[PDB]
Write a protein that binds this ligand. Structure first.
Ligand SMILES: [Zn+2]
Ligand SMILES: [Zn+2]
Lengths: 1612, 49
């Protein structure tokens, strides 16, 4: 009571302007008593913060704090009997209402676990409020401090600085755990230290549950077994083992019997059971269409560009949405296009045949708009119907394109020229042929693929590129694009979409489809030879999985010849295995299925199992997967039909076995050409969940809904504790029950007690002791708008629009300014179509729902005949509505089709209007918006609007005034969710939730637990504890590179020295092991600290893995309603409905440790037990083993004294390990020749270069930001890809696919661009800064104009070096620009004006001059900050040809323009400068009109040279000496041999060398480093400091003799 | 020398010619002389006897 006189005088400076602060103070000043002064004098600090969130938003503050059912009864509204919630502020108007809550936290950890409760308690209120007929718009407020306006921010901290003492004195002068959470809530801004000591100052109560744990969970562990008793125990165990279970035939391994595998493989692969045909082109359906196109074309124009010019003007005229709908704005320019076609027949005598049937119109056809082929008679009828509907359609919309419009056009009279219907009949009669047909739903003649010469097989893949390109840009067609005519045996194809593809100079193809977007379609493929049509088929495949072969004929025709030249030792074997392999490489890409991906991955385990000497017993019943179709057989007869061909013949087919292994391994990895994409994601999560639950209910531990806070009931407790003591049963001497999870409790005791003493090869000495934005919901992971945000931006948009027309009183909403807000905060008609069409269809289907419910809510905001019984509601509509609730979710599969036509087509009444009214005053969108779909042809959405129109959705209390758990909701800042007293299993606030997701690996989809925000801060502690303990260990290699490198360096020399080296695995290492095992291991460790020799307490870790024992794995919401419709997981649902029928949304468990949570806390457990088992063979089989570990794969190398007699060594080695629930997977294979570790296979004397993971990884992953960044990634993957020695010829054909993906993409070409061609040696010597010089001086082929800039660089660089200053004032000379800095340097070094006249004349046209390319400061600063501080691809390349060919360049002034507009402003300069290299280097006088971009190349040459001389060499300067056969397969090792003229340790000096360069950029965000750091900051294409702080990072390059000796040399 | 198996065919044990820096067996010795005299495993010449 020492501050109580200060308190009333402290807070008098807050004026009660309203009635909300007057009633507070007169019951504050009138109570000089500390007992209500901390209840009624303390609830004011909430009431000042709550008022801020009502002055900002539109709001009326709640002064009574009362219920919601009677806040709707103040208006005249019938009772809905809502649940009882209390709002801290509302605002109602009409029949919409704005609940706004208020809550404030400081730390983020207990903020999001208040936001996720508030949003769920608000959205569990709409469903009872929907039935009364009023919808809500709910908001929340995130506040991380106090920022009030009504006080002046200098007295509110005096509250929590002077009320923090009054409660300590108030309860010391005169309830238990409700005290210190108040302290952690009231305090100052918390720069709070988080560590393992944070757990220590909690309360630690008990539960009367952990005693029945400890009766089952620490009993057998005594942990100090004497080390002279374990040996005599294990001798009895082996004496039992060999006499007991081995000789009676229960051992798990065997001796491979190397002929029986190649009797087994024939019945494995050659499916003689089924009825497929041998001919490969027949069974598959797209191989047939390649074969039918490619033998119709091999054995064998100013008006055209005028037509395409007005077509590309129509493409710009469409994207403005100006003719009040999307129907007549398309027939209008249909009329324009048909008039411009009929104004060709009045020109030359012949043009529509000789120049148009060879181009854009086939028989009865026309090409227009988005992509539509329109096919003339039908088109002709439509225009006559539209002019019949309207007497004078084209008199005002003829030139409404002037006013309120662009008013820049080129259509001269075709706008107004009425198409003479008595004229087009002649043209429609002239060209007549059979119409396009597009199918749904005997003998062979296919010319026998092995019987074709070695040229006409390339003409398969060059039809495959051209069919794949027309597949890919069938994604680019606009994702709305509704047709003009809508609506399964065989369909004659009236109008449909279209893509084109050229083959030769007369004939083209077509590609016809109906559905736009990224799903599966029903395609059809035509040719057009000289006008004649010929149908060639139909197929059914999926677009975005064909991105692999888009331009890469030369890649996939160079590696099917690289891989063959490995077999020049049996020439007859090569000339047969050549023309069988290329059929396989066609057969994979022409049928990408996961199954003939999984099968080809499954042969790198069959192949170790035949070079080695012991294979596991069950593996041949695992390499088979049944052919679900009749297309996965013709691939599974060319793979197995190859391994029978060259693994084993009946004769001695073991001539050169090493290359046989190499060439079969790069056929097992020929798997990887198929795109990892998970073909549909609602059939991926069924598999993910079904793999999650089946090792769990088989053992019996899964439960249903827990409490999520603390307690468990008794029946739920019993299954948990019974799983606990059933996990630990497994007595030591029974060979049955060995495929069962858990540990033998008596064997783990020796395993830890021998670890206490120092006899394992590792021991616990444990240096440097360890004790030192939007975030989604957790039931739908992997998605891009989770269900919480899809309403939150709705409420934000409604609150933003509700205020904008109440400031002035417009009361009319604009149909683009109501789409201007959502499309802005998700990611002026031109700016919309700039940033509308840069979405994906996954987001277009969300943008439609947001537009939908926002316009419905706005219609409800100002709002204040059912006798269409064609089909009786009596049994249809009412039931559908009730079952499906709201109209928005109503299905279309309940009715027929024509009923949607006839029930829509009731007459005009009060439901409708005319003049669709593009201004649209509010209160009419329930009748205006319906007519816009009454006039456009769609019916179903009009049915939903007609239904949503017609009403068719229907003192004790003062002792309680101290803060109790009934007194929680009195405050916003109370922080109810706070950790205050942890329990045996919980943390009083949460229970460590998770959520499910998959990972998209190659063969089998891996699950991955997305965790919540408290769970990450409670997982990182344990994970870095194990990272601290395993740091002092010696055998793991998971986080440390160095020990992994020592393991590889051991494996190389120990394969070559006659060892017996294994390669293990562990089957379902994730979902078998449990946190209880980690508890029973962490009880009896010692870990004595080197600083203070004592036994440390691990209680802060022992009391947090108990939290991980009881996790709460969710279910995904996308699987809870697909299993609800209709498979042992499905039985697990449909036996837990005959209990209390709530859905099983939570599975508290015993045994998961999902792959990626507790990862390093099995990195030690995979090491302690491995050293125990690696001690078990030093003592009972007198050898000296050594066992590495990468937490999922092992290798236990074994030496032998003084060749597989000792199966007893290995079959015993499994038998102990299954006693510790470390199983050995049937994928394991052990012998003495091939051994593996993290997929780096070490064959005898060498390494297998493994060509087809790198090329298959570089053909994919083309990620697009800018066409300079995309020539960084693929240049780096070429730098690694020569470190395994592919060739240079495969390297120089990735680098034209990456060049022509740009030269197709509108950008054109530029002299840096993609990386160079004809590269031979310089991958060894030099980074990306060197290769550009060999690219630029490849243009100057006579080498007579960059010689002088090299001589000037010889003048400069010897002067700028040490021992001399020679203009170290260049910091300001560079910043003049680029164009004139060389004009300083050359006359510095000294020559005439004529040298600058003949040098500065060369200019390359740039595009990122003033700003850089935009599509929705250098990169130097973002490069330095990352040293300072710490979707499908084939739809992410289309956004690099859709938002780049449109407006993407910027000027120095405010503005933007096109690219074709810039390239239209350049002349023709034939006089020998443009004739150096065409279209790349220009003259000077040809750059008159466009003159503000052009830098020289020669300045870039000079800056690259002075960069490279800094970075290496002093030999970049010389003229290239002309170069200097060995066998084609003699490859060997080289080292980089670089001479670097800096000194190292640049980790800090780059920061200290910007003060002399640019001070304020450093403010807000050695010996030779400084003169070539200002030669980096002025552009982007240079890259020094990314290559001086790192190193070359491979340094071990291996290359052919014929492509390392053939190269040049550049000496000094 | 290195490991006691044939460098070429991997699955033999006995009666091996001590070649340059790698073993070689009598079975696979016949299948190298018909191509040329230079080897194709270490790329250095070999003894004939
Ligand atoms: Zn041999
Ligand atoms: Zn040799």
């Amino acid at each position: 009571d020492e501050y109580v006189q200060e308190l009333k005088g402290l807070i008098r400076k807050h004026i009660p302007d309203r009635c909300e602060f007057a009633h507070q103070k007169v019951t504050f000043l009138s109570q000089v008593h500390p007992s209500p002064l901390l209840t009624e004098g303390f609830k004011l600090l909430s009431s000042l913060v709550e008022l801020e969130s009502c002055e900002a938003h539109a709001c009326q503050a709640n002064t009574d704090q009362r219920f919601v059912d009677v806040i709707l009864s103040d208006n005249g509204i019938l009772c809905p009997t809502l649940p009882k919630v209390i709002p801290d502020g509302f605002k109602l108007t009409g029949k919409t209402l704005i609940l706004l809550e208020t809550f404030v936290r400081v730390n983020p950890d207990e903020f999001e676990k208040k936001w996720k409760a508030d949003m769920s308690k608000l959205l569990n209120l709409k469903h009872d409020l929907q039935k009364s007929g009023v919808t809500l718009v709910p908001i929340v407020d995130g506040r991380s401090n106090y920022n009030n306006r009504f006080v002046a921010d200098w007295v509110i901290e005096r509250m929590r600085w002077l009320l923090i003492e009054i409660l300590k004195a108030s309860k010391s002068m005169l309830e238990d755990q409700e005290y210190q959470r108040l302290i952690h809530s009231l305090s100052n801004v918390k720069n709070q230290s988080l560590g393992l000591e944070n757990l220590e100052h909690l309360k630690r109560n008990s539960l009367d549950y952990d005693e029945r744990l400890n009766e089952s969970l620490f009993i057998g562990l005594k942990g100090d077994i004497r080390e002279s008793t374990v040996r005599e125990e294990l001798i009895k165990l082996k004496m039992w083992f060999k006499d007991e279970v081995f000789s009676k035939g229960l051992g798990k391994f065997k001796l491979t019997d190397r002929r029986e595998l190649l009797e087994s493989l024939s019945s494995l692969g050659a499916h003689l059971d089924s009825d497929v045909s041998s001919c490969p082109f027949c069974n598959n359906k797209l191989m047939e269409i390649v074969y039918n196109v490619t033998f119709s074309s091999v054995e064998r124009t100013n008006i055209e560009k005028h037509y395409l010019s007005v077509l590309s003007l129509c493409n710009k005229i469409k994207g403005l949405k100006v003719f009040n709908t999307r129907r007549n704005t398309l027939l209008f320019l249909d009329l324009i296009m048909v008039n411009l076609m009929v104004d060709i027949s009045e020109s030359c005598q012949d043009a529509i045949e000789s120049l148009r049937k060879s181009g854009l119109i086939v028989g009865q056809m026309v090409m227009l708009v988005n992509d539509r082929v329109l096919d003339i008679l039908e088109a002709i009828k439509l225009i006559r119907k539209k002019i019949g509907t309207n007497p004078n359609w084209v008199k005002n919309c003829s030139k409404i394109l002037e006013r309120s419009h662009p008013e820049i056009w080129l259509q001269l009279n075709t706008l107004i020229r009425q198409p003479d219907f008595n004229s087009l009949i002649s043209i429609a009669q002239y060209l007549v042929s059979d119409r396009p047909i597009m199918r749904y739903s005997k003998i062979c003649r296919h010319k026998l693929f092995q019987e074709m010469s070695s040229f006409e097989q390339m003409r398969l893949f060059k039809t495959l590129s051209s069919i794949s390109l027309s597949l890919i840009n069938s994604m680019k067609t606009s994702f709305s694009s509704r047709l003009l005519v809508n609506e399964f045996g065989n369909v004659r194809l009236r109008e449909c979409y279209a893509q084109r593809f050229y083959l030769a100079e007369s004939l083209v193809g077509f590609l016809f489809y109906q559905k736009t977007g990224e799903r599966s379609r029903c395609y059809s493929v035509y040719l057009s030879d000289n006008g004649v049509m010929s149908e060639q088929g139909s197929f059914y495949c999926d677009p975005k999985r064909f991105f692999l072969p888009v331009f890469s004929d030369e890649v996939l025709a160079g590696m099917c010849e690289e891989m063959t030249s490995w077999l020049d030792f049996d020439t007859g074997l090569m000339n047969d295995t050549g023309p069988i392999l290329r059929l396989l490489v066609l057969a994979i890409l022409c049928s990408p299925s996961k199954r003939n991906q999984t099968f080809l991955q499954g042969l790198r385990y069959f192949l170790m199992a035949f070079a080695n000497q012991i294979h596991h017993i069950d593996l041949i019943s695992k390499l088979v997967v049944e052919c679900k179709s009749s297309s996965e057989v013709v691939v599974q007869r060319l793979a197995v039909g190859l391994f029978i061909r060259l693994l084993g013949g009946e004769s001695d087919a073991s001539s050169f076995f090493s290359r046989r292994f190499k060439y079969l391994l790069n056929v097992s990895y020929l798997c990887h050409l198929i795109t990892k994409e998970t073909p549909d994601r609602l059939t991926d999560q069924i598999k993910c969940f079904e793999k999650f639950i089946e090792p769990k209910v088989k053992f019996g531990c899964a439960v249903v809904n827990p409490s999520l806070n603390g307690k468990l009931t008794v029946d739920q407790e019993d299954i948990m504790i019974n799983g606990l003591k059933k996990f630990f049963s497994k007595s030591l001497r029974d060979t049955e029950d060995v495929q069962t999870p858990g540990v033998c409790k008596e064997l783990l005791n020796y395993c830890v007690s021998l670890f206490n003493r120092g006899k394992l090869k590792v021991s616990g000495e444990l240096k440097n002791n360890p004790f030192r934005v939007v975030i989604p919901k957790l039931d739908e992971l992997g998605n891009i708008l989770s269900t919480y945000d899809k309403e939150k931006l709705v409420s934000a948009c409604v609150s933003s629009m509700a205020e904008r027309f109440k400031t002035k009183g417009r009361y009319n909403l604009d149909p683009e300014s109501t789409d201007y807000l959502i499309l802005k905060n998700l990611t002026s008609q031109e700016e919309l179509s700039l940033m509308y069409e840069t979405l994906t269809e996954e987001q277009v289907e969300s943008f439609n729902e947001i537009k939908y419910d926002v316009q419905v809510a706005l219609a409800k905001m100002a709002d204040n005949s059912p006798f269409g019984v064609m089909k009786e509601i009596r049994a249809e509509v009412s039931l559908h509505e009730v079952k499906d609730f709201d109209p928005d979710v109503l299905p279309s599969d309940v009715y027929k089709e024509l009923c949607d036509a006839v029930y829509k087509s009731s007459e005009k009444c009060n439901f409708f209007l005319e003049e669709v009214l593009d201004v649209c005053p509010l209160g009419l969108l329930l009748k205006n918006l319906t007519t816009s779909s009454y006039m456009e042809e769609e019916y179903f959405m009009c049915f939903k609007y007609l239904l949503i129109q017609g009403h068719f959705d229907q003192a004790d209390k003062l002792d309680k005034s101290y803060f109790t758990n009934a007194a929680l909701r009195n405050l916003c800042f109370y922080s109810e969710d706070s950790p205050t007293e942890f329990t045996s299993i919980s943390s009083n606030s949460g229970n460590l939730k998770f959520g499910l997701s998959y990972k998209e690996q190659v063969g089998s989809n891996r699950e991955l637990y997305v965790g919540d925000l408290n769970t990450k801060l409670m997982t990182r502690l344990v994970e870095d504890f194990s990272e601290a303990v395993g740091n002092s260990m010696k055998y793991t290699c998971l986080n440390s590179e160095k020990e992994f490198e020592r393991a590889i360096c051991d494996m190389k020399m120990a394969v070559n020295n006659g060892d017996l080296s294994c390669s293990y695995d562990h089957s379902k290492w994730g979902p078998t092991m449990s946190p209880a095992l980690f508890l029973a291991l962490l009880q009896m460790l010692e870990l004595r600290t080197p600083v203070d020799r004592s036994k440390i307490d691990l209680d802060s870790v022992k009391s947090i893995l108990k939290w991980h024992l009881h996790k709460v794995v969710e279910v995904p919401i996308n699987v809870a309603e697909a299993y609800c419709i209709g498979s042992l997981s499905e039985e697990f649902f449909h036996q837990t409905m005959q209990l209390s029928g709530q859905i099983p949304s939570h599975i508290m468990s015993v045994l998961d440790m999902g792959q990626g949570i507790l990862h390093n806390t099995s990195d030690l457990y995979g090491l302690i037990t491995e050293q125990f088992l690696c001690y078990a063979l030093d003592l009972l089989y007198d050898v000296i083993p050594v066992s590495y570990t990468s937490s999922d794969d092992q290798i236990t190398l074994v030496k032998t004294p003084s060749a597989a007699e000792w199966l007893e060594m290995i079959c015993f080695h499994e038998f102990l390990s299954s006693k510790l629930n470390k199983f050995v997977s049937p994928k394991s294979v052990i012998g003495t020749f091939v051994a593996e570790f993290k997929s780096r296979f070490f064959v005898m004397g060498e390494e297998t270069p493994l060509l087809t993971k790198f090329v298959s990884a570089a053909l994919h992953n083309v990620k697009c930001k800018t066409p300079t960044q995309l020539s960084e990634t693929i240049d780096t993957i070429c730098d690694q890809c020569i470190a395994n020695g592919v060739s240079t010829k495969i390297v120089a054909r990735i680098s034209k696919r990456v060049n022509q993906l740009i030269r197709y993409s509108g950008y054109g070409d530029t002299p840096f661009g993609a990386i160079e061609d004809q590269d031979v040696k310089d991958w060894v010597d030099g980074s990306r800064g060197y290769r550009l010089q060999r690219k630029i001086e490849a243009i100057f082929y006579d080498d007579k104009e960059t010689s002088f800039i090299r001589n000037c660089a010889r003048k400069v660089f010897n002067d700028i070096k040490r021992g001399r200053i020679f203009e170290e004032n260049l910091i300001n000379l560079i910043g003049r620009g680029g164009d004139e800095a060389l004009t300083g340097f050359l006359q510095y070094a000294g020559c005439s004006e004529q040298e600058v006249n003949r040098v500065l004349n060369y200019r390359w046209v740039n595009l990122s001059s003033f700003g850089d390319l935009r599509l929705v400061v250098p990169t130097l600063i973002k490069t330095l900050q990352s040293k300072l501080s710490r979707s499908s691809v084939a739809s992410g390349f289309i956004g690099f040809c859709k938002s780049m060919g449109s407006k993407c360049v910027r000027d120095g002034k405010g503005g933007f323009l096109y690219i074709k507009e810039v390239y239209s402003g350049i002349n023709v300069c034939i006089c020998e400068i443009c004739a150096l290299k065409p279209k790349i280097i220009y003259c000077n006088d040809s750059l008159n009109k466009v003159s503000q971009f052009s830098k020289p190349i020669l300045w870039d040459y000079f800056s690259l040279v002075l960069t490279n001389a800094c970075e290496l060499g002093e030999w970049v300067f010389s003229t290239v000496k002309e170069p200097q056969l060995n066998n084609q397969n003699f490859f060997w090792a080289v080292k980089p041999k670089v001479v670097r003229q800096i000194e190292d340790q640049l980790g800090m000096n780059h920061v200290l060398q910007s003060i002399r360069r640019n001070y304020p950029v450093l403010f807000d965000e050695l010996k030779f480093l400084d003169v070539c750091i200002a030669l980096d900051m002025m552009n982007e294409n240079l890259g020094i400091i990314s290559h001086l702080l790192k190193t070359r990072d491979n340094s071990v390059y291996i290359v052919k003799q014929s492509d390392c000796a053939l190269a040049h040399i550049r000496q000094s | 020398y290195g490991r006691y198996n044939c460098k070429c065919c991997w699955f033999a044990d006995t009666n091996l010619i001590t070649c340059n820096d790698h073993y070689l067996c009598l079975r696979c010795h016949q299948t190298m002389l018909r191509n040329s005299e230079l080897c194709h495993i270490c790329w250095k010449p070999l003894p004939t006897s």
